[PDB]
Amino acid sequence: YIVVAFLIQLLIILPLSILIYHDFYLRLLPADSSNVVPLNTFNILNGVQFGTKFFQSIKSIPVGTDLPQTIDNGLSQLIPMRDNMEYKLDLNLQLYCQSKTDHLNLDNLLIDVYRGPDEKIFHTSRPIVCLALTDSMSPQEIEQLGPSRLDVYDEEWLNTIRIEDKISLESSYETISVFLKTEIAQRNLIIHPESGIKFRMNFEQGLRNLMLRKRFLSYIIGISIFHCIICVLFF
Amino acid sequence: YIVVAFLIQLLIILPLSILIYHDFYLRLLPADSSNVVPLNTFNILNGVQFGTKFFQSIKSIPVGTDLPQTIDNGLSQLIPMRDNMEYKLDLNLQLYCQSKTDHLNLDNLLIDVYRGPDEKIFHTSRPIVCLALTDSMSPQEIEQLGPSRLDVYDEEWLNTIRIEDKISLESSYETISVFLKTEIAQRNLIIHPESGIKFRMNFEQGLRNLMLRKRFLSYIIGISIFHCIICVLFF
Amino acid sequence: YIVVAFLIQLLIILPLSILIYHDFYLRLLPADSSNVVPLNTFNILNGVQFGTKFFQSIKSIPVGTDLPQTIDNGLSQLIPMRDNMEYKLDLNLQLYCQSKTDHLNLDNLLIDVYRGPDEKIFHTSRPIVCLALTDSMSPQEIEQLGPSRLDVYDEEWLNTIRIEDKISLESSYETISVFLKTEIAQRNLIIHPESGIKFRMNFEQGLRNLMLRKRFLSYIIGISIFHCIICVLFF
Amino acid sequence: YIVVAFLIQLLIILPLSILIYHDFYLRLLPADSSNVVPLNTFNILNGVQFGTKFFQSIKSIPVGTDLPQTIDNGLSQLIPMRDNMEYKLDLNLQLYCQSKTDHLNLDNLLIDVYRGPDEKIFHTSRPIVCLALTDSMSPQEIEQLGPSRLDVYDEEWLNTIRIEDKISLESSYETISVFLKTEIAQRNLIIHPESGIKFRMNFEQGLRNLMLRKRFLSYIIGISIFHCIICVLFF
C-alpha cells in the first residue's frame, strides 16, 4: 500500500532532481561552454603520404555576441570559439578498418593535430584492429554479441579512440587540422558518424572542469545525490 | 527487494503500455500534421560517380484545402506540403547491401539530402554491413532467428538507418533529393519497401514543449497508475 | 458424468455456430463478392527486360446476371466483375527463387500492376531470398522443420508476398496485368500454385470490409462469439 | 483442465477411429462407384519438349453390365467408365526427382490433364524437390528416419502430389492424357508404383450433401461415443 507512494515520490523527486541539476548547469556553467564538433563537419581531404586529414577554419566570436552552435548537419561549418578564451579539446573518434589486401590484421593508427598561424600540437598512435579477408563471423558470436551483424561489428571490430585534456587551442589561431594515417599499410578507414571533438572552455578550477569531462558520470552522481538528499529529508 | 521488483516490473510493463499510448496519439496524430512519403514514390536515377538518388518535385497546397495524403501506390507522385509553415524531415530508410566483389562485410553509406532553389541541407555516413560470397547461415542461426531465411536476413543483415529530427525543408524550395552512395566499393542496395521520409510539422516549440509537458505527464500518469495497481495486486 | 454432455453441447453449438455464421455470410455478404483468381489462370508471358508477366482480360457482367466463379482449373479464363462496381484487389503471391549461377543469395523482386484503357496502377519491391549452389540442408534443419525437405523449403526458403488494399480496379477497364521482375540478376521464379489475387467488392463500410479482409480471423472471432453467447445463455 | 484434457484426448482418439470408419465406408464404397486406375497402366511416351505423358484410351460399358475393375497387373489396359453418368478424377501421384545436372534441389512440375474429342481440362504446377550430387544423408537422419535408406528417401525426398476434386471427365470423351513436365531443367522422374488416378462418381449432390450429412453425423456420433466413454472411464 506504500510502493505506489514510493513511485509517486520517484516521479516527483527524479524529475525535480534533473530540473535542479539543469539549474546547476545553468548557474555553474554558461550552458553553452562545450561544443561537440563532429569530424564530418570538417573538410575531408585524402592522401597517400598522409591519411585522411580533417581541417576546418575558425571564426573568432567577439565577446557579448551569442555563441553559435555546431549543428550536426554534416555540412562544413566554421568552428565557433571566443577569440580571448583558452579552449581545451577532447578528440573522440571511433572507426572501423578494412583492407582488400590480406596483408596485415592489426595495425597502428597515427593521429596528428596541427594548427595554423602548420605548427604541430599533438601526436599519438593507437593500435587499431583491422578487418581482413580471412575473418569470419562465428555462429556463437552472432548468438551472443546481438543478432544484428552491424551490432556485432560494433561490439567487436569497432575501436574507440579517446583523447582527453591532451590538446589546447587558442582562437587567435585558425585552421585546426587532424590527420589520421594508418602507418603499416593502406587501409580503408570508416569513421563512425558520431565521432567529434569536444571544444571545452577549460576553467581554471579542477572540479568543474572534471565535471565537464565526465558528463555521463555527473549525470549519475549528481542525480543520485539530489535523490538521496531529498528522500532522506522527506523521510 | 521492493524497489528492485518495482523497477523490474516497470521496465517490463512500460513497453506494451507506451506502445499502445503511442498508437493512441498517432490516431490523434493528424495526417495533415504528419505524412509518410514512401521512398519508392520518388524518382530513382542510378549512377556510378553518384550513388542511387531519390528525387521528387513538390506541389504546394494553398491554405484552406484539406491536405492530401501520400498514398502507398508505389507510383511516382508529388510531395504535398503547406504554403510556408515549416516541415522537419525524418529519414527512416533500411536496406540490405550485397555484391560479388567479395569486398569484406563492411562499408560506408554516404547520404546526401539536397534541395532545389542544387543545394545541400544534410549529409551523414552510416557504417553498413554487406553480404558477400563467403557468408552462409549456420544451422544454429536458423534455429534461433526464425526458420524463414528472409527473417534471418532481416534480424541479422538489415541496415536500419534512422535519421530523425535533423532535416528541415522550406515549402518554398522544391525538388527535394536524397542520395545513397557507397564509399568503399560498388554495391547493390536493396531498399526495404517500407523505408520512407516522414514530414513532421515544425510548429512552435512553445506549444510543442507544453505538448511534451502534456505528453510526458500523460505517459507517466497512465504507466504509473497501471503499473502500481497491477504490482500491488500481484504482491 | 458431465463432460459427455459438455461434448454434446460442443457438437450442438459449434455446428450451429458455424451454421449461423454462414447465415451472417448469406445476409451481410452477397456470398459471391470475393473471387480468388489464381495467377496460373492468367496468360503467362516471359521476358528478359521484364520478368514473368501475368495478364488476363476482363469480361463485364451486366447487373442481375448471376456472377460466374473463377474455377482453379489452371486454364486461362476471363476475370468476372460487375461493370458498374468498384473492386479492390489483394495480391497474394508466394514463390521460390533459384539460380544455377552461384553469384548472389538475396535479391529484390519488383512487382508492377498495370491496367489497360498500359497505365500503371501499382509498384512495389520486396526483398526475396533466393536459393544458390552454396546452400546445404543441415541435418538439424531436417529434424526440426519437418522430415520432408519440400516442407523444409516451404518453412525456410518460401517467401510470401501479401499486398492488401493497395490496388483498386474498375471493370470499365480491361486486361489487368501483373509483372514480376527480379532486378539484380536473372532468377528462376517458381510461383507457388495457390497464389492468387482476391478481387473484393470494396464496401463503403469499414467493418465489413475488414471482415472480408481477415477471413480466417473472422472464422476465429465470430465462432468464438457465437459459442460464448450460446453457452452462457444456456448456463 | 477438463476441457483441455477432453480436447487433447479427442485429438488423440480421432485418428485411429476415423481411419477405421473410413475403411468401413470404403468396404461399403462400391468398386462400381469408385475405381483406382494405377498410373502405370496408361501408355507412357517420353519426350523433351513435352514431359513424360501418360495416355490411355477409354471403353464405355453400356448399362446393365457389371462394371469391371482396373486390375493392378501393370499391363496397359483400357479405363472403364459408364455410358454418360459423370466421373470426377482424383490424381494422386507421388514421385522422386533426380538428375546429374546438379541443378539445385528445387524445381517446378507442370501437370496437364488433357482429353480427347486435343483439348485441355486441368493444369497446375507443384514445387518439387529433386536429388542432386551434393546431397548425402547424415548419420543423424538414418537414426531418426528409419534405418532403411529407402525409408529415409521416402519420408524426406518423396513429392506427394494430391490433386483431388478438381477434374471432371465426360464418359463420351475418350483418350484421357496426363502430362508431367519439369519446367526448370531436365530431370528423371521416378513415379511411385502406387500412384494413380481415382475415378469417383460425380453423382447428384443432393444425395451427396445428405450423404455428407449422414457421413458427418455417423462419424461425430461414433467418435463422440467412444471418446466420451473411454475418457469418463479414464478420469
Numbering used by the authors:
A (entry chain A), B (entry chain B), C (entry chain C), D (entry chain D): 17 to 133, 147 to 264
Which sentences did the original study use to describe this structure?
A key component of the LDAC is the evolutionarily conserved ER membrane protein seipin. Seipin consists of an evolutionarily conserved ER-lumenal domain and flanking transmembrane (TM) segments, and less conserved cytoplasmic N- and C-terminal regions with lengths that vary among species. Lipid droplets (LDs) form in the endoplasmic reticulum by phase separation of neutral lipids. This process is facilitated by the seipin protein complex, which consists of a ring of seipin monomers, with a yet unclear function.
As an alternative, we purified the yeast seipin Sei1–Ldb16 complex by affinity and size-exclusion chromatography from a strain that overproduced both proteins from the GAL1 promoter at their endogenous loci. We refined the class with the highest predicted resolution with C5 symmetry, which revealed a roughly 145-Å diameter complex with two alternating conformations of the TM segments that were invisible in the three-dimensional (3D) reconstruction with C10 symmetry. We designated these alternate conformations A and B. In this map, nearly all of the lumenal domain of seipin and most of the TM regions are well resolved with an overall resolution of roughly 3.2 Å. Our model for yeast seipin revealed a decameric complex with the shape of a domed cage, with the lumenal domains forming the floor of the cage, predicted to sit beneath the lumenal leaflet of the ER membrane. The TM segments form the side walls of the cage and are tilted toward the center of the oligomer, coming together in a dome-shape at the cytoplasmic side of the complex. Two ‘switch’ regions (residues 40–55 and 231–243), representing the biggest differences between conformations A and B, connect the ring of folded lumenal domains to the TM segments of seipin. In conformation A, the N-terminal TM helix is tilted roughly 40° toward the center of the oligomer, whereas the C-terminal switch region adopts a kinked α-helix connected to the second TM helix. In conformation B, the C-terminal TM helix exhibits a continuously extended helix through the switch region and lacks the kink found in conformation A. As a result, the N-terminal TM helix in conformation B is tilted further (roughly 60°) toward the center of the oligomeric assembly and both TM segments lie close to the N-terminal TM helix of the neighboring conformation A monomer. The fly and human lumenal domains possess a longer central helix that is hydrophobic, interacts with LDAF1 in humans, inserts into the ER bilayer and is implicated in binding TGs in molecular dynamics simulations. In contrast, yeast seipin has two short helices with several charged residues (for example, Q169, E172, Q173, E184) and a different orientation compared with human or fly seipin, which likely does not insert into the membrane.
